Enzyme design. Structure first.
Site, PDB file in Angstrom:
ATOM      1  N   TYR D  26       0.225  -1.358  15.145  1.00 53.71           N
ATOM      2  CA  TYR D  26      -1.219  -1.492  15.092  1.00 53.71           C
ATOM      3  C   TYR D  26      -1.623  -2.905  15.472  1.00 53.71           C
ATOM      4  O   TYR D  26      -0.861  -3.861  15.310  1.00 53.71           O
ATOM      5  CB  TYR D  26      -1.766  -1.152  13.704  1.00 53.71           C
ATOM      6  N   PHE D  36      -7.263  -9.974  13.582  1.00 55.30           N
ATOM      7  CA  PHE D  36      -6.755 -10.530  12.334  1.00 55.30           C
ATOM      8  C   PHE D  36      -5.348 -10.067  11.991  1.00 55.30           C
ATOM      9  O   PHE D  36      -4.738 -10.633  11.077  1.00 55.30           O
ATOM     10  CB  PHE D  36      -7.692 -10.174  11.171  1.00 55.30           C
ATOM     11  N   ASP D  37      -4.812  -9.066  12.686  1.00 56.84           N
ATOM     12  CA  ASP D  37      -3.484  -8.562  12.364  1.00 56.84           C
ATOM     13  C   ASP D  37      -2.899  -7.834  13.564  1.00 56.84           C
ATOM     14  O   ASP D  37      -3.633  -7.259  14.372  1.00 56.84           O
ATOM     15  CB  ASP D  37      -3.529  -7.620  11.155  1.00 56.84           C
ATOM     16  N   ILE D  56      -5.312   1.661   3.285  1.00 59.42           N
ATOM     17  CA  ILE D  56      -6.681   2.009   2.959  1.00 59.42           C
ATOM     18  C   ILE D  56      -6.998   3.447   3.382  1.00 59.42           C
ATOM     19  O   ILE D  56      -6.266   4.090   4.152  1.00 59.42           O
ATOM     20  CB  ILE D  56      -7.653   1.016   3.616  1.00 59.42           C
ATOM     21  N   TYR D  82     -11.817  -2.669   2.850  1.00 60.93           N
ATOM     22  CA  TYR D  82     -11.803  -3.544   1.679  1.00 60.93           C
ATOM     23  C   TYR D  82     -13.177  -3.693   1.035  1.00 60.93           C
ATOM     24  O   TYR D  82     -13.268  -3.916  -0.178  1.00 60.93           O
ATOM     25  CB  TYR D  82     -11.243  -4.907   2.083  1.00 60.93           C
ATOM     26  N   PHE D  99      -8.992  -0.598  14.837  1.00 57.63           N
ATOM     27  CA  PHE D  99      -7.536  -0.617  14.892  1.00 57.63           C
ATOM     28  C   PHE D  99      -7.045   0.138  16.114  1.00 57.63           C
ATOM     29  O   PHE D  99      -7.541   1.223  16.420  1.00 57.63           O
ATOM     30  CB  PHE D  99      -6.929   0.008  13.638  1.00 57.63           C
TER      31      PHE D  99
END
Lengths: 375, 387, 820, 107
Positions: D26, D36-37, D56, D82, D99
């Site tokens: 991902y 961010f990831d 999540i 979140y 994503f």
């Protein structure tokens, strides 16, 4: 209890191994002697290839030992509220102190040769700033007794032994050009901290030894605690021996400097401080004699305590004598106008009565001899 | 009021005194027992005096009239005073020594002896070390006083504090006079402010407090650092820091030099910005490297943060804050999200300056100790936006 | 832009370097949550690329290296370094195989040293723990300060170490070429980062034997060859690079010391086995030959009668060869130890070519040559090089100083020891950071885990060697110092810090002595403890002094003077929290006075006997400061003790005087109870200070003086009045609902027990008439009350239990004494 | 909630079942476009078991609709995600998440 004391073969292996570790450490490692101080000092003193460059003669770069002394002097000069302990400084100061002295009829030739060798070994240090470093560390301690100042005092004594005039002059010149009160303030505080005989502590130790309870861990009968009475006797002798060595050889300049520091804004009279400590010691000895007055025979711990006190008083007397010798008229007048007379009166009283008491029992002959030498 | 006190006051300036012989010529002559003289407090400028209404006090020069303020040193309390000494030309005999002689202070006209009042009830309960000093007929043994030298640096600092306090208080008074009064289309019509004197004093004090050069040799640099710390502490104890803060507040009330001019005039408006920058620089010099002086801002940290946005002395205010944060852990503990957000807003509004990042770094850690709350606040506020 | 443009763009370079500095600051010192967050902003790929990037400016290169270390390695290296000083060696076959030198033809003494960092290490170091960085994971519902602490982000250590080795080798090779385009623009910027990373990985233990060999060859191939390229030491380097080299050499010397310790432990295992077997055989011989000669048999048995440590010392006392014969051991067992001693001396180099041929020689010559070649301007480098020189010159003393930190455990205890090591690591980490709720919860959890652990009980010497109690004290005192004046922060954590230290003293005397050594410092921090509820540093001190006559006698005056000064201050002003809560203002703080009084009780009175040395001093100090006695017993204008008790009872009845009277804890102070407890404790302390009967009998003047002083302070009539004072008793009414006195707000039997103790020790009972008077006034009514309460409803009541304790403890023994 | 848009097709026959480990790559981006990831930067596929609640809600439901070999873009509202508390440092409050998920295999 002995029946419960199990044979070691019954003991578990790991406990036995730890016991073996302590026993081996105490009996074998500590007993082993290895001298590396002289070799280390020589290795650090030698400077290599500077002649090969031939510009290093003009430059005068420090040798490794000089650099180490400079590092420690830097640490001392650094502005701090308190002097943090440095095991490194302690170890290196011990090494140098050892190196310097590196010690039944002796010829004049031989004695002169040992004097010359000691002078060379002291030169190795004071050519490299060791005296100034010693003074700086004494100033830095700021009157707090510790292993650091103990090592510093030992180093100073080691380099000053034999009354080295060159070290004396270097110290005095450094002090006079710096004009710092911290050095003598620290000395004064150290004297004020220096301890004397305490009858209460003596009695408490006697009670503890009499109890001798068995420790829950294993068995420790009559367990002994760290000496409460005059534990800092070595430090006291070192301090007063340092002060004496500074004036040794009838150095009137340093004697008068101890009496008063003309350039400095404030003045401290080390001679009067010494007199005050001597008076305190005399009072302690008189009280302790009174404690033992009725008793027919002094016991062993009392003998040891008297011996420590009289060794300290011997060093103090020698230091005062060395101040006044030469003679230094100002020091003579200061002592004449001080309380030294009262101290001498008390000492004479104790000397007479303890002489008569000690004469009665032969076992006390050694303590009597020490008393007479102190007189 | 005069007290006997022990502790840091011995190092402090307010325990300093100056001896002024009555004769102008040969005032530097050796002091002599029974010599009439005046005793002046350096920082305040006031003279020891005997007043019927309050007995022993310090009075202004105008009130001093040589009968209240005349004192003598006496070796012994027994008093004959049969013959007054003749005036002597030259330095004269060296009668009185530093740190050795025991001197009794006697008020010449009354003949009274300086002594402690004795504890008032509940003073012994407090255990306070302050013993009020009085002039008494008999006194005690103990009245004798040693005289101890003072370093030239410290004496100079005391005199400098006296002058600076007078000048800055006069400046503050001039500001307060027209604080709320616009001059309009006319002059303020008040006494002219001492702008040039304030500027010169600030510059001289900044040079006075300038840190030693890094190229300097280690021992000499350490000596300079000690002198600087002692001097900072003396000024702080005498309150020059608070005076600087008061001046800064009075100048800050006005946003700009024009807003200042509507009250004080253009001739002061030009120097307004220079003066505020100089004041912030002096504050930073006073507190730089001084743990206690930096810690004082724990009570008023909002005082610094509130002023960060201001353009005229942004760099000076930021340097002040940086000094405080490097020195004082207390400030770090009392930091809040509002302060962190204000500093981040300072980045946003004034641009990318690495000094703000250094301030943020100082917030995180001091002397090997980390402040987790400050770390997390900085992260949460600054980083996730990524702008 | 390309980040490489920052070479010419200088302002951006400074900004980004200081940004990396800020990242390191925020993740500094265990903020693993912030490290996980930073893993997003700077990723593993970015960091590795930066490590390999030649064209970066030196500031950015070093910043990225340091950021990698801070995010991934700093906490692990810190914990490992903290543990490294200690040497806990399990007894295992791996430990047994360890030898000073590695198997070979040459004799162990003359036989060549093995390579440092290569071999078997059995000392226990807790493993590293890491957590993968994931930002799509479910957010825990649990609130902050309750969730478990986050681990440092994970980094692939095998790849990182291989990369570090390769980069270091390339740097060495290019430095050999002396090119004009170094990475980072300088030899420093090139070498320092790689060296720091390598040292971190070494301390963390990542590198294996072969890679350690590669690093050793990089350092110096000739010395470290095992059976052209130029080594770093020969290169010629700036001071910072030399400093990193010093750190590596430091690590390798540490490894040599660790190997020496482990070899000594293994030899101890084998030698102890042999000695135990021989001792068993000798005692069998003795049990067979006792018939032959009784006297010599008994004299030999004296050995077995001695404690095992003494037996070991006697057996080992054969070094000088003057005591060879007295040692029962045979020549072969002696010779094994002699050979091991010679081998250890050789390893340390004590037994006395230009080519160094050893780490010690290499290091000594390198330091001397550096100092000779240049006047070092870095004090840090000077200190490092000369310290390392000292170690090389005296390894044996280094081993001596390391041995106290060496401990042997059975392999069975390994798991518990590792758990304890983890907990101690967390506690040590807590030192640097300021306390918060999360850190408090963690400290409490670690303390509880340690208490649960058996090794804490079985191996107290190990705890003392580890210095865990000192760490707890340091944390406790930092928290007390923070916000000391305003109000006490983290009372729960401080309470845990006693329970721990205070139990630790209870475990063993040596622990109690160790805490006694810090007694004064505890007393320095005690001042707040009076306001503090629960366990406190004053209780720690009480544990340090309790039931040990040696410690009580060793106790120094100035501490008692300080306690007495605190007690005076309590007698002089009131506590500011009671007034803030609204309690009626009074002169003095009976609660704090009580605290100091029971401390002095524990000091003076030990194991059923008073310590006159401390008691006489306490009396003198108290008379010098009579405020400690209380506003009662003041002297001038002072109400008597009995009137004070009666006024306290009236206060207890009357609200707005006991309390504000405008409590989830229900411990809220009641002024009457506090006053009565204060006076009872003072009376108990005085009675305990009272001299013993046999001293009285001997007629010692000081004892008589103390007793007279105590009698003057406390008259007998007041004690008898207090003993006669009624005590509220439970009753049934209004459907029989138990009306039961509230103890915390009421006069209680212990208050009377203190007076009874004072009467017995000071005044005594000698005459029948006085005995009968006391019985009719105070004792018999209380006994009748207890008996009446001896019913099903009342028997378990708190007042009934208190009366039974008071009677059995104080009254009944006195009546037995006075029975004639 | 979850919006799924197929970037590249999968087999179309295999879908994650409860108690079945999903292995994915991902790349995580906020709706503004900031990353961010990414598991691919770490070079290690991310494994999570369906129905545990490790990931999540957005991941749970979105991967439920995906197939082996399938690459998809998943848009997840804060409620799934979140939310108001956010992920400190990484994710601001009330942030929609984008994503790019490739479902490599199931195990």
């Amino acid at each position: 209890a002995c029946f419960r004391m199990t044979p070691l073969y019954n003991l578990p292996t790991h406990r036995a191994c730890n016991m073996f570790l302590e026993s081996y450490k105490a009996a074998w490692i500590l007993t082993e002697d290895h001298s590396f101080e002289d070799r280390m000092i020589d290795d650090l003193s030698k400077a290599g290839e500077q002649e090969e460059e031939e510009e290093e003669v003009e430059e005068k770069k420090p040798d490794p030992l000089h650099q180490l002394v400079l590092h420690f002097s830097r640490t001392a000069l650094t502005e701090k509220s308190k002097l943090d302990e440095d095991y490194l400084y302690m170890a290196y100061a011990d090494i140098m102190a050892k190196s310097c002295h590196l010690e039944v009829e002796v010829s004049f030739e031989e004695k002169e040769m040992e004097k010359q060798r000691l002078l060379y070994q002291q030169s190795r240090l004071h050519t490299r700033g060791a005296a100034e470093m010693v003074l700086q560390m004494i100033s830095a301690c700021k009157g707090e007794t510790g292993a650091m100042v103990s090592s510093t005092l030992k180093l100073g004594i080691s380099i000053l032994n034999g009354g080295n005039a060159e070290v004396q002059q270097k110290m005095l010149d450094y002090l006079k050009d710096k004009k710092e009160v911290g050095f003598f303030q620290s000395i004064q505080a150290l004297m004020q901290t220096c301890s004397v005989l305490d009858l209460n502590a003596f009695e408490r130790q006697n009670k503890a030894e009499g109890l001798g309870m068995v420790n829950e861990d294993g068995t420790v009968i009559n367990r002994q605690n760290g000496e409460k009475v005059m534990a800092d006797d070595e430090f006291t002798q070192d301090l007063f021996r340092f002060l004496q060595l500074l004036c040794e050889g009838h150095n009137n300049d340093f004697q008068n400097y101890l009496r008063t520091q003309t350039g400095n804004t404030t003045t401290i009279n080390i001679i009067i401080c010494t007199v005050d400590y001597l008076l305190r010691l005399q009072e302690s000895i008189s009280d302790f004699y009174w404690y033992y007055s009725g008793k027919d025979v002094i016991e062993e711990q009392g003998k040891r305590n008297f011996s420590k006190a009289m060794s300290v008083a011997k060093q103090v007397f020698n230091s005062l004598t060395e101040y006044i010798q030469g003679p230094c008229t100002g020091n003579q007048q200061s002592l004449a106008h001080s309380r030294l007379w009262d101290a001498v009166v008390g000492f004479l009283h104790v000397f007479a009565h303890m002489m008569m008491k000690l004469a009665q029992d032969s076992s006390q002959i050694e303590l009597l001899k020490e008393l007479l030498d102190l007189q | 009021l005069v007290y006997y006190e022990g502790g840091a006051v011995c190092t402090h300036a307010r325990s300093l005194w100056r001896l002024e012989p009555l004769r102008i010529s040969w005032s530097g002559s050796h002091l002599r027992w029974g010599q009439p003289l005046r005793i002046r407090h350096v920082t305040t400028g006031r003279y020891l005096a005997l007043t019927e209404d309050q007995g022993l006090v310090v009075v202004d020069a105008c009130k001093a009239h040589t009968k209240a303020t005349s004192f003598c040193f006496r070796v012994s309390k027994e008093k004959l005073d049969t013959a007054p000494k003749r005036d002597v030309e030259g330095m004269g005999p060296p009668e009185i020594k530093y740190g050795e002689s025991l001197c009794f202070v006697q008020h010449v006209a009354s003949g009274l002896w300086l002594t402690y009042a004795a504890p008032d009830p509940k003073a012994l309960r407090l255990g306070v070390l302050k013993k009020k000093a009085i002039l008494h007929q008999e006194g005690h043994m103990d009245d004798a006083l040693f005289l101890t030298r003072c370093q030239q640096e410290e004496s100079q600092a005391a005199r400098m504090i006296h002058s600076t306090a007078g000048l800055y208080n006069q400046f503050i008074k001039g500001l307060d006079s027209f604080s709320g009064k616009p001059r309009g289309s006319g002059p303020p019509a008040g006494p002219a402010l001492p702008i040039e004197a304030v500027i010169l004093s600030l510059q001289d004090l900044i040079g006075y407090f300038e840190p030693p050069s890094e190229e300097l040799q280690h021992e000499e640099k350490q000596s300079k650092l000690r002198s600087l710390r002692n001097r900072q502490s003396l000024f702080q104890e005498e309150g020059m820091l608070s005076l600087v803060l008061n001046c800064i507040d009075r100048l800050n009330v006005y946003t700009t030099a024009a807003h200042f001019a509507e009250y004080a005039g253009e001739e002061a408006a030009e120097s307004w910005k220079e003066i505020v920058n100089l004041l912030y620089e002096l504050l930073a010099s006073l507190i730089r490297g001084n743990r206690a002086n930096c810690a004082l801002f724990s009570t008023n940290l909002d005082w610094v943060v509130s002023k960060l946005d201001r353009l005229e002395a942004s760099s000076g205010i930021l340097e002040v804050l940086y000094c405080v944060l490097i020195e004082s852990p207390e400030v770090l503990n009392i930091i809040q999200e509002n302060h962190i957000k204000s500093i981040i807003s300072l980045l946003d509004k004034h641009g990318r300056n690495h000094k703000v990042l250094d301030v943020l770094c100082s917030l995180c850690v001091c002397n090997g100790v980390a402040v987790r709350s400050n770390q997390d606040l900085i992260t949460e506020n600054l980083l996730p936006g990524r702008e | 832009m390309d980040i490489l443009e920052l070479s010419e763009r200088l302002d951006l370079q400074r900004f980004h370097s200081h940004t990396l500095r800020l990242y390191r600051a925020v993740c500094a010192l265990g903020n693993n949550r912030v490290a996980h967050a930073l893993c997003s902003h700077v990723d593993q790929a970015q960091l590795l690329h930066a490590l390999e990037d030649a064209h970066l400016p030196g500031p950015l290169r070093a910043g990225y290296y340091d950021l990698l270390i801070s995010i991934h390695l700093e906490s692990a290296c810190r914990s490992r370094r903290s543990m490294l000083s200690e040497y806990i060696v399990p007894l295992t076959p791996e430990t047994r195989a360890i030898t000073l030198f590695p198997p070979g033809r040459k004799g162990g003494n003359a036989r060549r040293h093995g390579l440092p960092g290569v071999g078997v290490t059995t000392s226990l170091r807790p493993p590293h723990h890491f957590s993968p960085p994931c930002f799509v994971a479910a957010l825990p519902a649990a609130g902050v300060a309750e969730a478990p602490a986050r681990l440092s982000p994970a980094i692939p250590l095998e790849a990182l170490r291989d990369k570090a080795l390769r980069m270091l080798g390339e740097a060495v090779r290019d430095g050999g070429q002396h090119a004009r385009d170094p990475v980072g623009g300088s030899v420093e910027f090139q070498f320092v980062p790689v060296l720091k990373l390598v040292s971190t990985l070494l301390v963390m233990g990542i590198f294996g034997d072969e890679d350690v060999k590669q690093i050793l060859k990089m350092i110096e191939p000739e010395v470290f060859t095992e059976e052209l390229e130029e080594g770093l030491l020969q290169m010629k380097l700036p001071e910072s690079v030399k400093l990193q080299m010093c750190n590596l050499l430091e690590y390798f010397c540490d490894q040599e010391l660790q190997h020496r310790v482990e070899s000594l432990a293994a030899f101890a295992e084998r030698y102890v086995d042999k000695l135990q077997a021989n001792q068993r055989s000798r005692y069998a011989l003795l049990m067979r030959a006792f018939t032959m000669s009784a006297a010599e048999t008994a004299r030999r048995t004296r050995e077995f009668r001695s404690p095992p440590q003494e037996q070991i010392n006697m057996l080992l006392h054969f070094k000088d060869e003057a005591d060879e014969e007295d040692c029962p051991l045979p020549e072969d067992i002696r010779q094994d130890l002699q050979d091991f001693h010679q081998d250890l001396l050789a390893h340390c180099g004590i037994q006395l070519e230009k080519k160094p041929q050893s780490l010690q020689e290499l290091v000594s010559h390198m330091v001397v040559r550096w100092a000779q070649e240049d006047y070092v301007q870095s004090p840090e480098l000077v200190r490092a090089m000369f310290s390392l020189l000292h170690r090389q010159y005296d390894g044996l003393g280094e081993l001596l100083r390391a041995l106290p930190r060496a401990y042997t455990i059975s392999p069975s205890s390994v798991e518990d020891t590792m758990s304890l090591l983890e907990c101690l690591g967390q506690i040590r980490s807590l030192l640097i950071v300021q306390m918060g709720p999360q850190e408090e919860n963690l400290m409490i959890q670690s303390i509880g885990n340690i208490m649960n652990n058996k090794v804490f009980y079985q191996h107290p010497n190990l705890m003392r060697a580890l210095g865990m109690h000192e760490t707890v004290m340091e944390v406790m005192v930092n928290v007390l110092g923070g916000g000391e004046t305003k109000e006490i922060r983290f009372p729960k954590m401080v309470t845990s810090c006693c329970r721990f230290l205070c139990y630790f003293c209870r475990i063993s005397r040596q622990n109690q002595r160790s805490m006694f050594d810090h007694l004064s410092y505890l007393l320095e921090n005690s001042g707040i403890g009076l306001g503090m509820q629960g366990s406190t540093p004053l209780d720690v001190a009480a544990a340090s002094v309790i039931d040990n006559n040696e410690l009580a006698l060793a106790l120094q005056e100035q501490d008692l003077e300080k306690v007495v000064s605190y007690l005076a201050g309590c007698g002089l002003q009131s506590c500011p929290m009671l007034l803030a809560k609204g309690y009626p203002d009074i002169g003095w703080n009976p609660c704090g006075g009580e605290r100091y009084l029971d401390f002095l009780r524990f000091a003076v009175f030990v194991n059923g006997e008073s310590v006159e040395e401390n008691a006489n001093v306490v009396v003198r100090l108290l008379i010098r400061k009579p405020e400690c006695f209380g506003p009662a017993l003041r002297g001038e204008g002072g109400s008597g003790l009995l009137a004070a008790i009666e006024e306290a009872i009236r206060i207890s009845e009357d609200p707005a005087r006991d309390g504000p009277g405008v409590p989830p804890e229900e411990n809220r102070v009641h002024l009457g109870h506090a006053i009565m407890s204060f006076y009872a404790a003072l009376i108990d302390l005085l009675g305990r200070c009272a001299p013993e009967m046999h001293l009285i009998q001997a007629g010692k003047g000081e004892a008589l003086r103390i007793r007279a002083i105590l009698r003057s302070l406390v008259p007998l009539d007041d004690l008898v009045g207090i003993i006669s004072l009624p005590l509220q008793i439970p009753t049934l009414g209004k459907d029989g609902a138990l009306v039961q006195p509230k103890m915390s707000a009421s006069f209680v039997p212990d208050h009377k027990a203190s007076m009874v103790l004072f009467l017995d020790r000071v005044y005594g009972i000698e005459n029948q008439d006085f005995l009968l008077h006391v019985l009719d006034v105070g004792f018999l009514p209380d006994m009748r009350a207890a008996a009446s309460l001896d019913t099903a409803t009342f028997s378990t009541t708190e007042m009934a239990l208190a009366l039974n304790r008071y009677l059995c403890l104080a009254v009944l023994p006195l009546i037995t004494k006075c029975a004639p | 909630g979850v919006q799924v848009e197929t970037i590249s097709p999968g087999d179309g026959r295999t879908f994650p079942k409860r108690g079945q480990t999903c292995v994915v790559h991902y790349t995580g981006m906020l709706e503004d476009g900031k990353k961010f990831d990414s598991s691919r930067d770490r070079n290690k596929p991310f494994k999570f078991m369906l129905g545990k609640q490790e990931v999540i809600r957005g991941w749970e439901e979105g991967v439920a609709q995906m197939s082996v070999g399938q690459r998809a873009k998943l848009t997840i509202s804060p409620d799934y995600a979140y939310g108001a508390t956010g992920h400190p440092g990484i994710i601001p409050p009330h942030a929609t998440l984008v994503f790019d998920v490739e479902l490599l295999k199931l195990e």
